[PDB]
Design a protein around this ligand. Sequence first.
Ligand SMILES: [Mg+2]
Ligand SMILES: [Mg+2]
Ligand SMILES: [Mg+2]
Ligand SMILES: [Mg+2]
Ligand SMILES: [Mg+2]
Ligand SMILES: [Mg+2]
Ligand SMILES: [Mg+2]
Ligand SMILES: [Mg+2]
Ligand SMILES: [Mg+2]
Ligand SMILES: [Mg+2]
Ligand SMILES: [Mg+2]
Ligand SMILES: [Mg+2]
Ligand SMILES: [Mg+2]
Ligand SMILES: [Mg+2]
Ligand SMILES: [Mg+2]
Ligand SMILES: [Mg+2]
Ligand SMILES: [Mg+2]
Ligand SMILES: [Mg+2]
Ligand SMILES: [Mg+2]
Ligand SMILES: [Mg+2]
Ligand SMILES: [Mg+2]
Ligand SMILES: [Mg+2]
Ligand SMILES: [Mg+2]
Ligand SMILES: [Mg+2]
Ligand SMILES: [Mg+2]
Ligand SMILES: [Mg+2]
Ligand SMILES: [Mg+2]
Ligand SMILES: [Mg+2]
Ligand SMILES: [Mg+2]
Ligand SMILES: [Mg+2]
Length: 174
Amino acid sequence: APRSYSKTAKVPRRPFEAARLDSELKLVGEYGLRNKREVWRVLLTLSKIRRAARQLLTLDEKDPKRLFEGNALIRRLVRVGVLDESRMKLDYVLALKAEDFLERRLQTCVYKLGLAKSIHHARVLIRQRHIRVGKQIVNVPSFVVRLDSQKHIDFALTSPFGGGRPGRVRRKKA
RNA sequence: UAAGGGAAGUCGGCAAAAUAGAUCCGUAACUUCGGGAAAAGGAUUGGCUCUAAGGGUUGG
RNA sequence: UACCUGGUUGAUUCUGCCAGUAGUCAUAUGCUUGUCUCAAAGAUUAAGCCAUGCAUGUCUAAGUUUAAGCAAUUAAACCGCGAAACUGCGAAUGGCUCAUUAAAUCAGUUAUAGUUUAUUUGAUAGUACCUUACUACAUGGAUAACCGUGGUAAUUCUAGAGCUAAUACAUGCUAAAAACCCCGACUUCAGGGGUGUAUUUAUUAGAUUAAAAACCAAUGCCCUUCGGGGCUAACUGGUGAUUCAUAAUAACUUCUCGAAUCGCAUGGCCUUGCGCUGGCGAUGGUUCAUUCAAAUUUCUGCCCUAUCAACUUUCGACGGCUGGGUCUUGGCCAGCCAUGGUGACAACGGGUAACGGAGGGUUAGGGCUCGACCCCGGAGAAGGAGCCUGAGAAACGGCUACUACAUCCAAGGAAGGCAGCAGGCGCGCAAAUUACCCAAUCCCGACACGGGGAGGUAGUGACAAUAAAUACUGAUACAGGGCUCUUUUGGGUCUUGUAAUUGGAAUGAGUACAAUUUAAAUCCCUUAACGAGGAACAAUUGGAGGGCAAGUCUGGUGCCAGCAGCCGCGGUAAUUCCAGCUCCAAUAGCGUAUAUUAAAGUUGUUGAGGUUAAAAAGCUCGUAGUUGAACCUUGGGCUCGGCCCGUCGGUCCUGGGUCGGGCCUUUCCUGGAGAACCGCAUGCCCUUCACUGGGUGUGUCGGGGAACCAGGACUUUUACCGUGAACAAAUCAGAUCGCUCAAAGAAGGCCUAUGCUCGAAUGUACUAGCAUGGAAUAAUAGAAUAGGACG
RNA sequence: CCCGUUCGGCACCUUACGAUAAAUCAAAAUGUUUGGGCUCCUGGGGGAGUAUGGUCGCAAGGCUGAAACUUAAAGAAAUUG
RNA sequence: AAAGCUAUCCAAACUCGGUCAUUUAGAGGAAGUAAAAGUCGUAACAAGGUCUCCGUUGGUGAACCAGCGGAGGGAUCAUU
RNA sequence: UUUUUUUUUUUUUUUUU
Ligand SMILES: [Mg+2]
Ligand SMILES: [Mg+2]
Ligand SMILES: [Mg+2]
Ligand SMILES: [Mg+2]
Ligand SMILES: [Mg+2]
Ligand SMILES: [Mg+2]
Ligand SMILES: [Mg+2]
Ligand SMILES: [Mg+2]
Ligand SMILES: [Mg+2]
Ligand SMILES: [Mg+2]
Ligand SMILES: [Mg+2]
Ligand SMILES: [Mg+2]
Ligand SMILES: [Mg+2]
Ligand SMILES: [Mg+2]
Ligand SMILES: [Mg+2]
Ligand SMILES: [Mg+2]
Ligand SMILES: [Mg+2]
Ligand SMILES: [Mg+2]
Ligand SMILES: [Mg+2]
Ligand SMILES: [Mg+2]
Ligand SMILES: [Mg+2]
Ligand SMILES: [Mg+2]
Ligand SMILES: [Mg+2]
Ligand SMILES: [Mg+2]
Ligand SMILES: [Mg+2]
Ligand SMILES: [Mg+2]
Ligand SMILES: [Mg+2]
Ligand SMILES: [Mg+2]
Ligand SMILES: [Mg+2]
Ligand SMILES: [Mg+2]
């Protein structure tokens, strides 16, 4: 069977716009990202919700299609944490910005919760198996943490921090 | 009249051979549009027994 | 997310193209390449040629066993396993490719009342019918396997000779009794023959439209208070529609089927006879229905081309009739007759580097383009044709013949079809191992057991896609931005950088005990002891004048070499070449070439342009086509209801607007099964003008207007719009679930457990077809020689 | 011959509520606020109205009518020299 | 009941012509395009020194010239 | 209103309060 697969980013329409290049570099440095692709990734996803939210606003308020689809969109937004309970219904979705979707990343939250003291150290720890969510170890910095899950981040029980067992370097100096 | 070859004969296919009636089919370049044209090239053809069509005259 | 920029000029506004830009599930190629998940992959050209190996076989108690086979069995009488062979079934599935093919395939929608059907499923068959020497307590003859004798160089070649089985082949009796038609000696009224199903022919039934009196022609029958009455009966299926379903009669047949088959359990009865009976199954069998289907078939819809305008018809072209052939209809074919059929609304012919579609890419809307290829349909197996077996084939891992190619040879002969899976050659810009296995998905077989290059697994694999390493950090010294002061003792220690100055912790790339995965392995996942200080475990691809982010740097060359998609650079001061340094863009990726899309309002229906930039025929007539003046029921009123816009909030009723319904204003019957109006049997209020305690479903007088069934009559017809039914999955949009997130997938979650549960949604069917409503808009008819309407 | 009205013509003069890139236009207006009806033609410049096929003509020629290849401009109206 | 045989039918294949479609060789001839410091003239752009252009015909090394008819895209929007 | 032909290739400009 032909297995479905898709793309998570788009190359910008104009390759060498000075304003666009500078704005992207603001997000890369602030959040300690890797390249421009995962910046384009978040913008593509953010466009998807914004495109979907706008197309429903064109319908009728009483129209059942808008009611079901609109509430479905908000539930993911509220659950993820980019949106609050007081943001009804969809006019506040259009105010979402690329920055807002970026704090919900595990790289940012591990830093905003004081686990790491620099955003570059924060990403390194996650990818290096030193951060777990609940009972689950997560090593993907793009892991989007929900508000419910935001209260269950701590170091891994196998890591020298939290677990206590010395690592390879500390054992070597013995 | 001649086996096999088929112009190697000869200045040269000279001489001979080959084709040939009728019916049906098919017919090129070129053209002064009239022709070429029977172009080229094919098929049938006997005997016997039948069948059908194609007329006239006189009385409606 | 409805978008532009550079380039004609000394400068300007345009027409207009070129270039730049981005996407592609779109191919190739260059450089580079650490990890995880998923994964395309000899289509383009040569449907070209193929060495070799494999890809289709199959046994249950339940078809046939004397293996001189095993295993325990009895002298014997034959079974527990089980080979060979006969028998049955399958081999017509699957897999591969896209050569042919343009009303053809195909798609949606129709029909088979014009047909066949192995298998599955449910039913389903009583027949004195007539042949053998006869039998039903049971018929006959062959042939394998086997023993032995060979042939040829050679084949999955076979002969001669001796046996021997059937669920292989061929025969063959039947069940009583009822009822019906025919023949019938017998004074005016016994007996014998035939009657299952299958086939063919012929005939009959298979009904039903409102009622009554006369010579009957024919017996009129019964009831006869001997007038007169009833009566040759009662019942009778289905479809919109049939000569249908079905029944009956007269016959017919190279006379089908109606069990001479196998296993388990073995039990009952009395006339004790090796007597009569008893289930479950297996296989098989006629008809009907059903299933998988197949085959034709109705309507509508296909790219370019007029430098294709007429095509078909001698020898079928359009049709009618009779017959043949077919499973069946049909010019499908054979005979006879007639002259038709298609076309400017594009027939016929030609091209396709054309299999059709679901769909892929890209788009605000309208579109453009691709679709060999994981799914459905079609066709093919080197190129044509023919055919056997078979339910099913015009089969090719079947046969026969011809052409091409090709193999062995003792030269007499024999044998062949990779567009099946690997592999090779050739071809090309262009595409992988002559690996492992049926464990998973399913299929086939006599079948729980065997087989499956279908299929899965692994290897090659920068097709494409997802996640994501190449580093983290403290202090010291310095600088900057602040803060109270400017006595500038300024770092004093809030922050950020430079720290070429140092100390630290952590880990995976790799590696490997062990565990895990798997048919067995690999990898991922898990994890002992290993594995990091730059020299290491070292990221690349393009560029730095503009479009377009980034150099006023240095050396070399000197219109040379060279660069440059375009404009342009280079002639001894090159921001463009060759290099060093520095920087910019993307980053495990980047560049290049070709195809296509947007940009392109540069194909314009939406939506281009035609005085001068390309473009109004020299002018007029005119056919096809396209388009075409106005005009026919409007207005008003009576109302009734839904929804929306306000205050009333009943628990923790109100006006207006819109929409719809019936009536007035010149505006369907038959039987009504229930409806109903006119009064209702009761009932209801009322002028003081008849008292009351009853009765749901209703009968009749009667029924202007109505949904109900079912028969018929009267409806102008098309276009258009609304609604409804039906309308493969997959794809797309889209709902849910922490595969560690993601691409994905259809999972999962809860309880400690005992086992408990939600899901696996929803939308999408343009055009053509079906049903109904709407009656403006666009067409067409109607009464004029009235051959007009009305009882 | 004079004055005026009207229909139908050949044109002209001023103006822009409009149009066009502009020159200019009572049509080249009523068009991004884009749909009255019909026909024909054009898609950067060349090659080229050429080659070939067809057809008409006595001929000269007419009508129909490409492609390979090549090129970053060709061209229109105005401006200052 | 095998071989064989009679007559139709389906019909491969080959030969011989015809037609369509698509490629391809060719002496020679006549064009186009491109490349530049080649020879000869100077036809056009000003009244380009004979105003330019169109159709047709004839001629000439070459651009071109001339006759007939037309146009202004003219060097005249005008003479009472 | 006598006539007056020709001129070898390339080279001829940028930013803001
Ligand atoms: Mg001689
Ligand atoms: Mg557009
Ligand atoms: Mg120009
Ligand atoms: Mg310039
Ligand atoms: Mg382009
Ligand atoms: Mg198949
Ligand atoms: Mg049955
Ligand atoms: Mg006929
Ligand atoms: Mg017939
Ligand atoms: Mg093809
Ligand atoms: Mg092909
Ligand atoms: Mg055959
Ligand atoms: Mg192969
Ligand atoms: Mg550079
Ligand atoms: Mg640039
Ligand atoms: Mg810039
Ligand atoms: Mg245009
Ligand atoms: Mg011109
Ligand atoms: Mg012009
Ligand atoms: Mg004119
Ligand atoms: Mg009309
Ligand atoms: Mg006039
Ligand atoms: Mg164009
Ligand atoms: Mg052109
Ligand atoms: Mg000019
Ligand atoms: Mg002049
Ligand atoms: Mg001029
Ligand atoms: Mg000069
Ligand atoms: Mg000169
Ligand atoms: Mg000169």
